[PDB]
Design a protein around this ligand. Structure first.
Ligand SMILES: [Mg+2]
Ligand SMILES: [Mg+2]
Ligand SMILES: [Mg+2]
Ligand SMILES: [Mg+2]
Ligand SMILES: [Mg+2]
Ligand SMILES: [Mg+2]
Ligand SMILES: [Mg+2]
Ligand SMILES: [Mg+2]
Ligand SMILES: [Mg+2]
Ligand SMILES: [Mg+2]
Ligand SMILES: [Mg+2]
Ligand SMILES: [Mg+2]
Ligand SMILES: [Mg+2]
Ligand SMILES: [Mg+2]
Ligand SMILES: [Mg+2]
Ligand SMILES: [Mg+2]
Ligand SMILES: [Mg+2]
Lengths: 96, 223, 53, 67, 106
RNA sequence: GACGGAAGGGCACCACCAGGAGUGGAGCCUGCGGCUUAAUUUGACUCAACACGGGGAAACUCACCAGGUCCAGACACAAUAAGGAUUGACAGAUUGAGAGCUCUUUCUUGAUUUUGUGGGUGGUGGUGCAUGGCCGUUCUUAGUUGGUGGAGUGAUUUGUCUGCUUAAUUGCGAUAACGAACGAGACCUUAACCUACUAAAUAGGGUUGCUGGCACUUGCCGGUUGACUCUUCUUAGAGGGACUAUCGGUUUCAAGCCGAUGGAAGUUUGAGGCAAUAACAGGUCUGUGAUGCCCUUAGACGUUCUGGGCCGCACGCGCGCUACACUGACGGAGCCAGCGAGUACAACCUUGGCCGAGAGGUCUGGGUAAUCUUGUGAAACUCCGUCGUGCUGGGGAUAGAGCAUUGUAAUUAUUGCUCUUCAACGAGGAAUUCCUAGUAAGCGCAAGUCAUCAGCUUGCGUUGAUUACGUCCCUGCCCUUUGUACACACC
């Protein structure tokens, strides 16, 4: 919960770049893959997001899978401050 | 690169298992049935079989794309080395897993359990299976718990023809008083097999001889 | 963020942690499975292991 | 120990009924005939059936037999 | 132009025997079509991966065990050809479950 | 139905005969009591608890105890709202302590939060008598069922049986039943045979080059991936092969059993894998982000560090190891296996060279493996020697000291080695386990856990018997006939 804001911002940015965040169930872990933060910081943030809509979470084998809803996307837009016609994977990352 | 061959194989299997688990977790509402993995040159091919294909697809690259991304994040592949393909589970009744899922859904909804079981059995029969066996274990009215058993048709139990023809499914259903367990068996028709043996090993059927009026004294056909 | 929050956990039953459950008990670490026994048994056919003899 | 099952004996009987001409005496030939005519799944089962048929044939050449 | 004959070793590994055999057959057919210097589909001793588990989850009961075994089929084929031809041969004739592997060059 | 201190008939080395090998005795490992303890965490108590929870705990594990640390108090609503919400904090006293744990401090930190109230989440907390799944057990025994038809007013019954057979409700038969299904069998995996195919410098040979040693005639043993070719051994694909075959007895001349003969194979060919109907208040909520409900929820039963405990000993029992010697012991020397396993982001297996009585170091390698460890030249064994039956050179427990190794940490010896010490036990009472052929037993090796530790475990080979080839006497189970005032079923 006691999260330095820069880290949070970074996490948000990462999410917007992707739309998907996969994180190990590892509190007491120094660094997360891709993001320059502790795993715990990520995981708790995602939990918080979930708790008021925003993010959908899945568990499978000690390894959290986080996806986003449209409300979540909106929230991200509001907070991170990205305009419109931008990345995610929710409204097509490209064409697959 | 540079890992023992047996070990590599084991890891592959493990990965597959993990994937299956993930699919079970996620695509329950869509009615997930089976995964296929093809490690071809350049790209890994994940084929998904689910009851709701459209849902899986999403907004043509909304849900599937997300799934792909997740996979990439997990097993660490390049953005473009994983492809996903949703498919029709051909004959939903001949899939036990699907049936189990359906049953679970029904239970969740709040259907009469016995009735539901009967319906399932009927469906199975329609699908053209030799036999169905549905065991529903748990607390079905009153605290003292009992496994109810709803069956129809053939069924085998012992031998190697079990893993050949009998398809099994086990799903536990969560309710606010305790857990149910739904165990579904389907005996597939031996004649309608595609790949493998086309009958039960004990079944011996002989062909009929043809009619004879033979003697009538020598004679020769000449050219 | 504390001054410390860890003791040396590089080996023993502390280091090895299951894929599925996270159990430190009855762990099959042969062929690099790292799956605890019961779970492995449950999902053995998915790995490709079979009961022949 | 060695006592033949329904699925051997009955089948053998049926075979005999159908094909007494051309199902004669010695084992190998009988086996071959079985392979040709009957849709036997396993090899061992087929072999057993053939053996039974041979036995039946042998019994026959000493008088009639029930069933 | 390109045709300089190398030393090519091709590894095949699977759990399914029939599939592997089919793959081997396909490879041989390809070789025949291209009619090159050939060493046969050499079969390596099948590797049985063993596991022993108490059938019980809890421990109580008569102590009964499992023998979960996974059999590995490893087979290799030796060809003397240009590499491009080998690649062409191996780009097709791929069946799911069988691992196709190429050493390439001496 | 269940039961019977009723009568019949079966079956089984978890029954007994004919024997073997023994445990129970002894010293020790190690389970479980009991005791003891700050704690010596618990689960399980006839088969079906007791070297079991893959439970070989130095911490971790970890559930226990003595203490400290942290918030991993979602989110909802409010009091401060920057003149600071609140985070951070070396120096010593503080403290086990380069824990700002704090109390000395007065420098930072910027609305993340903290103070309450709704609300949760985590729990190797509780209940397996609320459950799932899995498993164990009735039982791997031969059992179980419905469709017609018959007998009953009916619950029911017959089929599913007097016999003889079989490992088997396996069959032959007899017959108000007839034809079926599940189980048994079939099956599948494996172990046996293949001079018949298809193959190989990641298997093995042949000739032949060069080459080393021989007798010295051509001949014998060698070293070399120098050539060429082969597939018997090798591996593993596709096949084949045994079906009790052929014959002889014996039996309603049936099913079958017995004896030869041929054969790789004649105990279901050897061994398993799977395994019905109905169940058990059998075991697990200490495998689970399987889980109901209850407890708990910031002096937490969440955790996380730190030390200890699970291992303590007047004592019961439960698997085991070592032995009580001359069929040996100790020294040489000879010298043969099969299952395995094995790292690049780590530190796997580790030959070969030097150093060391060891243990070990060290340098170098080879191997992600039919390629290197590895021909795992393993033990038991066989050959010649020293002692010859004396708690003796049998035997090895406690001990004392040193030298190594793993790890952050070895006292409460982790373990390896060195010298010394030499205890109990001259084959084990009342009892009772396991077993019928490549089996019993002897002997190692191997993976499993593992950083380190094997007296344990799944496998594997090596050496290889004795004695039945049977019967209900005992024991347990099953069936039939009977009795019952039991049907929560003789507790
Ligand atoms: Mg059957
Ligand atoms: Mg069977
Ligand atoms: Mg018993
Ligand atoms: Mg203990
Ligand atoms: Mg052990
Ligand atoms: Mg838990
Ligand atoms: Mg119970
Ligand atoms: Mg009737
Ligand atoms: Mg009856
Ligand atoms: Mg005769
Ligand atoms: Mg058998
Ligand atoms: Mg109980
Ligand atoms: Mg609980
Ligand atoms: Mg035991
Ligand atoms: Mg070797
Ligand atoms: Mg002495
Ligand atoms: Mg230890």
């Amino acid at each position: 919960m006691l999260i330095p804001k820069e880290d949070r911002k970074k996490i948000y940015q990462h999410l917007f770049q992707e739309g998907v965040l996969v994180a190990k169930k590892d509190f007491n872990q120094p660094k997360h893959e891709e993001i320059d933060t502790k795993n715990l910081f990520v995981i708790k943030a995602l939990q918080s997001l979930t708790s008021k809509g925003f993010v959908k979470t899945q568990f499978s084998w000690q390894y959290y899978y986080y996806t986003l809803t449209e409300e979540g996307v909106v929230y991200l837009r509001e907070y991170l401050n990205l305009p419109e016609h931008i990345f995610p994977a929710t409204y097509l990352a490209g064409q697959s | 690169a540079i890992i023992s061959k047996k070990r590599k194989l084991v890891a592959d299997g493990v990965f597959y298992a993990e994937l299956n688990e993930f699919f079970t977790r996620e695509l329950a509402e869509e009615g997930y049935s089976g995964v296929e993995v093809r490690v071809t040159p350049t790209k890994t091919e994940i084929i998904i079989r689910a009851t709701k294909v459209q849902d899986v697809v999403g907004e043509n690259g909304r849900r599937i794309n997300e799934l792909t991304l997740l996979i990439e994040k997990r097993f660490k592949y390049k953005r473009g080395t994983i492809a996903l393909y949703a498919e029709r589970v051909h004959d939903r009744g001949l899939s036990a897993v699907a049936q189990a899922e359906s049953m679970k859904f029904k239970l969740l909804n709040g259907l009469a359990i016995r009735r539901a079981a009967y319906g399932v059995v009927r469906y199975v029969m329609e699908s053209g299976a030799k036999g169905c066996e549905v065991v529903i274990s748990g607390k079905l009215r009153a605290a003292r718990a009992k496994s109810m058993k709803f069956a129809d048709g053939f069924l085998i139990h012992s031998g190697q023809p079990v893993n050949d023809f009998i398809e099994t499914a086990t799903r536990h259903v969560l309710l606010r008083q305790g857990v149910l367990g739904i165990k579904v068996k389907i005996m597939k028709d031996p004649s309608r097999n595609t790949s493998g043996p086309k009958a039960l090993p004990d079944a011996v059927t002989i062909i009929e001889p043809k009619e004879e009026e033979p003697v009538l004294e020598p004679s020769v056909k000449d050219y | 963020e504390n001054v410390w929050y860890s003791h040396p956990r590089k080996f023993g039953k502390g280091s090895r942690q299951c894929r599925i459950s996270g159990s430190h008990s009855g762990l099959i670490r042969k062929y690099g499975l790292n799956i605890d026994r019961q779970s492995f048994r449950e999902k053995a056919n998915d790995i490709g292991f079979y009961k022949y003899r | 120990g060695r006592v033949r099952t329904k699925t051997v004996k009955r089948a053998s009987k049926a075979l005999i009924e159908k094909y007494y001409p051309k199902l004669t005496m010695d084992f190998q030939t009988n086996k071959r005939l079985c392979d040709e005519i009957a849709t036997i799944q396993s090899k061992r089962l087929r072999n057993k059936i053939a053996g039974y048929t041979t036995h039946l044939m042998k019994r026959i050449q000493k008088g009639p037999v029930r069933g | 132009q390109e045709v300089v004959i190398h030393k090519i070793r091709i590894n095949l590994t699977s759990t399914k025997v029939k599939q592997l055999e089919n793959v081997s057959a396909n490879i041989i057919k390809n070789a025949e079509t291209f009619k090159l210097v050939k060493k046969g589909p050499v079969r390596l001793p099948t590797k049985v991966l063993k596991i022993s588990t108490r059938k019980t989850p809890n421990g109580e009961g008569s102590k009964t065990w499992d023998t979960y075994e996974m059999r590995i089929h490893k087979r290799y084929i030796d060809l003397e050809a240009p590499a491009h031809i080998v690649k062409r041969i191996t780009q097709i004739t791929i069946e799911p479950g069988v691992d196709v592997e190429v050493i390439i060059a001496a």
